[PDB]
Amino acid sequence: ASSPANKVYQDRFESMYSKIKDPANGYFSEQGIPYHSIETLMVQAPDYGHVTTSEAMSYYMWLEAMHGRFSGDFTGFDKSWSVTEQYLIPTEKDQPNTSMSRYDANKPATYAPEFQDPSKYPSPLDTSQPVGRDPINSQLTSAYGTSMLYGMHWILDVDNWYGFGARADGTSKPSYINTFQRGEQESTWETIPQPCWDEHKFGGQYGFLDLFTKDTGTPAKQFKYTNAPDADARAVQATYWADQWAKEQGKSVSTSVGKATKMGDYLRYSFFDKYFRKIGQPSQAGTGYDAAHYLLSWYYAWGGGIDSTWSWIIGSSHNHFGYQNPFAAWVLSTDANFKPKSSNGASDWAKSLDRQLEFYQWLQSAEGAIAGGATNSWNGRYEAVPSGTSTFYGMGYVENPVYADPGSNTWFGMQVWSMQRVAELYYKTGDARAKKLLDKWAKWINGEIKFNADGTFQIPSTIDWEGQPDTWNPTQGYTGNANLHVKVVNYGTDLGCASSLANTLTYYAAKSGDETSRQNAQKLLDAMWNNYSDSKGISTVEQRGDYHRFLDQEVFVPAGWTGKMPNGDVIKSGVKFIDIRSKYKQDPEWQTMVAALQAGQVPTQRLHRFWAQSEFAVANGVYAILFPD
Numbered sequence: 278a279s280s281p282a283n284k285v286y287q288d289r290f291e292s293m294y295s296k297i298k299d300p301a302n303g304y305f306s307e308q309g310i311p312y313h314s315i316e317t318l319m320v321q322a323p324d325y326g327h328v329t330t331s332e333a334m335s336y337y338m339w340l341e342a343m344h345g346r347f348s349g350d351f352t353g354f355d356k357s358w359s360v361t362e363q364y365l366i367p368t369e370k371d372q373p374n375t376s377m378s379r380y381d382a383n384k385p386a387t388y389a390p391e392f393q394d395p396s397k398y399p400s401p402l403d404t405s406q407p408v409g410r411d412p413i414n415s416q417l418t419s420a421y422g423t424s425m426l427y428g429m430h431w432i433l434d435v436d437n438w439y440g441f442g443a444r445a446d447g448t449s450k451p452s453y454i455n456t457f458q459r460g461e462q463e464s465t466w467e468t469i470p471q472p473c474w475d476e477h478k479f480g481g482q483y484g485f486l487d488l489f490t491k492d493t494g495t496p497a498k499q500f501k502y503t504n505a506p507d508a509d510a511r512a513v514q515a516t517y518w519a520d521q522w523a524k525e526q527g528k529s530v531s532t533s534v535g536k537a538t539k540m541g542d543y544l545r546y547s548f549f550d551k552y553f554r555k556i557g558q559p560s561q562a563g564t565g566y567d568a569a570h571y572l573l574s575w576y577y578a579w580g581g582g583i584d585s586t587w588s589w590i591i592g593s594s595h596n597h598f599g600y601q602n603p604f605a606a607w608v609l610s611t612d613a614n615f616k617p618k619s620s621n622g623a624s625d626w627a628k629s630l631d632r633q634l635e636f637y638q639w640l641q642s643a644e645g646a647i648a649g650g651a652t653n654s655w656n657g658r659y660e661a662v663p664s665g666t667s668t669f670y671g672m673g674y675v676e677n678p679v680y681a682d683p684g685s686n687t688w689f690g691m692q693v694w695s696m697q698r699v700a701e702l703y704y705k706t707g708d709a710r711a712k713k714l715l716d717k718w719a720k721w722i723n724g725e726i727k728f729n730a731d732g733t734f735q736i737p738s739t740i741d742w743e744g745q746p747d748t749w750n751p752t753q754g755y756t757g758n759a760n761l762h763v764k765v766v767n768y769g770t771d772l773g774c775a776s777s778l779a780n781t782l783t784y785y786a787a788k789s790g791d792e793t794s795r796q797n798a799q800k801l802l803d804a805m806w807n808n809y810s811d812s813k814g815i816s817t818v819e820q821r822g823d824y825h826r827f828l829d830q831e832v833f834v835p836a837g838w839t840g841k842m843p844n845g846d847v848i849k850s851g852v853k854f855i856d857i858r859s860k861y862k863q864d865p866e867w868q869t870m871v872a873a874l875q876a877g878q879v880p881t882q883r884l885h886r887f888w889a890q891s892e893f894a895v896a897n898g899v900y901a902i903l904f905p906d
């Protein structure tokens with residue numbers, strides 16, 4: 278039987294769970310897939326409220342796992358995995374073996390440069406630039422008997438709002454789509470949504486392919502998917518807890534553990550440089566593992582021909598601390614129940630755990646917050662690293678890895694999402710490296726939490742950075758990085774971040790015994806429950822300062838390129854964000870949003886983000902278990 282839990286916080290979790298699963302609240306589609314948010318007019322990472330992401334699916338797993346802990350019923354957890362495998366992990370029909378089996382581990386893909394402005398795309402493929410060797414593909418095909426990859430594609434058009442349908446039929450749902458393709462300056466507002474399965478049926482003469490890639494020949498019909506490593510790692514994290522809590526009650530989630538383990542085996546593709554170039558010596562093609570940084574990079578992607586047989590796979594050269602997950606690495610490298618079937622699966626994850634913890638430490642600022650990350654490909658073209666730039670195993674430090682509109686590390690959220698995982702590791706193992714990191718980080722954040730007399734509160738929202746960490750010397754260790762400073766630009770009341778923060782402080786307090794962290798975690802949970810609860814969970818009114826981009830953001834389209842979206846919207850030079858998403862004008866909130874912009878005001882919204890609601894629910898559960906009295 279499981280240990281007794283705090284009755285008050287357990288009830289709060291159950292209440293949230295009921296609101297989230299309540300059919301009348303609309304968090305899920307008819308097919309059982311959770312939406313990014315109840316509200317449809319939503320632009321953040323995705324550009325429509327009813328698309329879904331792998332991040333959401335992993336939070337759904339975490340939620341159901343906790344429900345199993347308190348109810349003894351894990352059928353919901355197994356169902357979250359069933360929905361994931363059926364709809365977010367490309368099936369045999371979505372990534373045909375005929376093409377995947379033609380993959381050449383000695384020539385994974387063809388080099389394509391990255392540019393700092395979307396106007397430079399399409400990017401020209403260059404067969405003469407070196408590409409390294411993929412050392413794990415043989416391990417995976419031998420272990421699983423297939424050339425298909427088992428990982429979640431990151432974004433899904435749940436109700437086929439864009440109209441691409443499934444495998445170009447234009448009518449089926451859900452629909453595999455993608456957005457980002459053109460460099461660090463292409464924000465959510467500057468993309469051209471495209472189908473993952475491109476048969477040239479929609480868009481331009483050759484679909485949407487020649488908007489991004491340029492080659493000598495004619496663009497072939499092809500499919501392509503992109504993984505979000507932090508999402509897949511969270512799936513492993515959540516499944517571990519589901520397994521632990523299931524066994525404490527004589528229950529089993531064996532089938533799900535097997536899927537989580539397989540996913541973690543394939544997740545190793547994120548450990549490699551985009552084009553398998555040697556880490557620290559980007560101009561040279563890798564010979565195998567010398568191209569592995571062992572960190573959870575921003576993505577790994579793969580694709581292949583539809584009407585011709587060929588395939589490719591790429592890792593990623595850019596690393597952000599926010600995507601790391603030391604807990605998942607500990608699970609996959611030490612727990613016998615989660616040991617990957619591949620020959621080197623567990624050992625690679627063992628190396629990743631150590632490398633990840635060094636990464637966090639190297640990036641810890643003088644104050645305690647964690648800095649951006651590093652890259653093995655300067656400017657995304659393997660250019661020379663500017664002299665005087667600090668390095669980590671040969672990779673140059675970057676303040677805002679991967680994207681700059683806005684800066685990828687200017688949002689407080691990355692701090693809690695990532696440190697929450699370090700707190701789980703510290704709690705389970707008491708690891709000294711995790712302790713050192715948390716003691717200083719927790720001291721920093723506890724001094725940045727502000728509680729008001731009316732029961733409301735504020736935490737860091739937008740942050741900025743100055744300087745850089747000292748070059749990492751494995752034998753020297755943490756120098757203290759006296760020249761690396763974080764700056765809190767402004768505060769806010771982001772309920773999702775606050776929930777993640779409470780979670781982090783709870784695990785840390787439980788292990789360290791730090792009372793300051795424990796009471797702050799409880800005050801956050803109480804404040805949110807007592808002051809921000811509504812019939813659908815929790816929420817607050819927030820300003821949407823970037824919404825002016827709905828109408829004033831021009832979308833770049835190559836000269837002479839013309840095409841049409843499924844609903845007829847014309848794609849040509851000069852269009853704005855709204856011009857290629859005209860269906861948005863039918864949204865219930867549209868007139869309200871436009872009215873505000875016309876009056877020169879900042880639009881405001883009351884949003885119910887699925888991950889935020891789940892975060893809050895899980896945080897209540899965690900407190901209930903670690904502090905029963």
Ligand SMILES: OC[C@H]1O[C@@H](S[C@H]2[C@H](O)[C@@H](O)[C@H](O[C@H]3[C@H](O)[C@@H](O)[C@H](S[C@H]4[C@H](O)[C@@H](O)[C@H](O[C@H]5[C@H](O)[C@@H](O)[C@H](S[C@H]6[C@H](O)[C@@H](O)[C@H](O[C@H]7[C@H](O)[C@@H](O)[C@H](S[C@H]8[C@H](O)[C@@H](O)[C@H](O)O[C@@H]8CO)O[C@@H]7CO)O[C@@H]6CO)O[C@@H]5CO)O[C@@H]4CO)O[C@@H]3CO)O[C@@H]2CO)[C@H](O)[C@@H](O)[C@@H]1O
Binds near residue numbers: 388390402576588683
């Ligand atoms: O036919 C002739 C011949 O053929 C051959 S076979 C041959 C084929 O023909 C050929 O087509 C094929 O070509 C291959 C090629 O080989 C491969 O090398 C390439 S690889 C390619 C890959 O496919 C593609 O997917 C990849 O895309 C990358 C981009 O490069 C990269 O730039 C971006 S970065 C992006 C991030 O990913 C996003 O997450 C991020 O999003 C941000 C957003 O920017 C930001 O605004 C918001 S801010 C937001 C916060 O999120 C929120 O929390 C807070 O609360 O609020 C704030 C404020 O709102 O955050 C978002 C994140 O959350 O944005 C950045 C920037 O865009 O990443 C994508 C990943 O997808 O690029 C790769 C290349 O660079 O693929 C080709 C396929 O076409 O090659 C074949 C051979 O190899 C045959 O053999 C012959 O016979 C035949 O004759």
Ligand SMILES: [Ca+2]
Binds near residue numbers: 463467682
């Ligand atoms: Ca931009």
Ligand SMILES: [Ca+2]
Binds near residue numbers: 741742743744
């Ligand atoms: Ca700076």
Ligand SMILES: [Cl-]
Binds near residue numbers: 321322886
């Ligand atoms: Cl969001």
